[PDB]
Amino acid sequence: YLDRKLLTLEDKELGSGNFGTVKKGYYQMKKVVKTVAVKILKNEANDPALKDELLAEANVMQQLDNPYIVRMIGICEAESWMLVMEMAELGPLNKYLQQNRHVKDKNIIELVHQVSMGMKYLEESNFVHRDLAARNVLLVTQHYAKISDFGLSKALRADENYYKAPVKWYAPECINYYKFSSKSDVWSFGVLMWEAFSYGQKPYRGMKGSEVTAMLEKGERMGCPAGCPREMYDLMNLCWTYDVENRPGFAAVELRLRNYYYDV
Template sequence: MADSFKASSEFGFLLCPLTHQIFEDPVLAEDGQTYEREGIVHHIQKNGTSPLTQQLLSVDQLRPNSIIKKIVNEFRSKHYYFKLDTHIKKKSRRALFQAHGKTVWEAEWIGKDGPSICLMKINGIKALKEASFYEKMTRHPNIVKTYGIVDEPANITSHSITLLQEYASEGNLFELLQDQPSMPNEHVLSEIFVQISDAMVFLAHNQVVHGDLACRNVLVFRYDANEPKHNLVKLTDFGLSRGSSMYAPLGTASTTTLTIVPIRYAAPEILRNSNNKNSYTEKSDVFSMGVLMWEAYSKGEMPWSNIENDNEVCQKVMNGERLKQPSKCTDRM
C-alpha cells in the first residue's frame, strides 16, 4: 500500500495544468510545460500564448512527451489502494449525497497536493476485491475516473465497497440545470449529449449496460453557457446497475441501487419484466438516453411530473405513450 500511495501522492505532474485531468496525450510546449494536446491546441488557436507564462506558442512546435506518457501508462497498469485517515480523509462527516445504499463524501489528500477527490461508498452489493474494472472503464474522457479502492479501518460491513473518485465541483447536470436562470443554449446541450453518447458507446463496446441514465448521473466538470466546446461532463454510476455482470443483488428484501428500477426513465421492456436481468440492454439505455435529453430540455423537470403515481407512469409507457416534445426543443432535435 505504501508503494501505491507514493505513486498516487505524486499526481501533480500527471495532471495537465490546463485541463486539470490526468494526461491522455501529453505534449511539450515551447514554454517548457507539458499539456494535454487537445487542450493546449485549442488554447493556442484562441489566445496564441502560454496559459502559464504568456509566452507566444505555436501548435507546430508541440512535441509528444513520451516520458510522461510512459509514467501515466505505468500508473494505470497497477491497482491502487488507499487507506482512510492515512492517505486521504473526508472533508466533512456530512455526506454530499446519500440515497439507496450509496453515500458520497468530498475528500482531500493528507500531506500532498492532488486532484479534487470524493469517496463513494456502496452498500448491499458483492464488491470486487480490486479496482481494475473501474480503472479500465474510466479511461474514457467522459467517464468519471476512479483512482482506486479505499480501505476503511472502521468498516465492518462485508458487503460494501468504497471508491476514490475524481470530484466534480460543478455538481451533476440535474443540479446545474435547476440553477440556471434559463435553459442552456441548444448548441451547449448538443455538446453535452454528444459527450454522454460517446461515453455510452464506450460502455456498450465493453458490454456494460448502464441501467440508470439520468441527468443526476452526469457530473459537470466545466460549464460554459457561451462556448459549447468548453463544457465537460462525465458519466457516473455505470458499473453499479443491475445490467452489469459485476454486481448482483444480495436479496430482494434490501433496498439498494440494484433493487430499485428508475421507473420514469426505464424502457417498456424493463417495466414489463424488471426482475429479468436480460431486459437491461444497450437498447434500454438508448431509451433512457432519450428521457435524459427530454429532462435536459425541460430544465431538470421530472419526467411525467404531471403524474404522481409511478404505477400509472408504468402503464402509460407500456401502452406506448411517450413524453411530449419539450417547448424549447426544436423539431430537428
C-alpha cells in the same frame, strides 16, 4: 485499495442518497494531491446490499477508460467503505440545470452528446449501464460531462446482447421481460435528454410506475420541453421506440447528435 492516511475528507457532505454520503476530499498521489469525490456508505456499511453494490460499482469502473466516464481512484475500507473518484466539480447534471436556467440549448446539445459518446464506448465495451438518468451525469465544467453511478451496471455475456435480471427510465422490455441491453440504455438516454432540456425537471411528473407503463403501452409519450429544439425532441421519440430491434443503438444516436450540433 487506498491508504486512509493519504485521504482527507471535508466534514460537510456534498449530498446524500439512499446509500449514504458523498464528500469532497483530497488524495495524495505520487507528488501532487488530487481533488476527489468520495461515496461513503451509511452506518459503517452494515447493509450487505450496499457493500455488494459498492464492490460491483468499483469492479466495473476499474475496467473503464474513457474521457466521458468518471475515473475511479480506488476504494478505501476505514470507518466505512468508501469509493474514491476523480472530482467532477460542478456536480450532478439535473441539479446544475435546475439552478442555471440560463444554459443555452446549444450547450445542452454538447453535454448530452458527450453522454452519448461515453455510452457509445460502454456499448462497444458490451457493458449495460442500467441507471442512465440526468442525476448520474457529472459536470467537470459547464461544457464537459461524464457518466458515473455504475452500481447497477453489468458486463454482458459474450453470447447475448442483454442481461436478464428507476421505472420512469426503463424501456418496455425491461419492465415486461427484465431484459437490459444497450438498446434499453438508449431508451433511458431519451428520458435523460428530456430531463436535460427540461432544466432538470423530473420525468412523468406526478405519475405512479404502473401509470407510466400503461401510458407507454398506449403509444403516448412525454411532450416536448419548452424551448427544446425540434430535432432534439424528434430524437427523444426515436429513443422511445417501443420495438428493441427498431430502436437505434448509441452509434446511430451519437452520429445524430454530432450532425445536429454541427448544424446549430
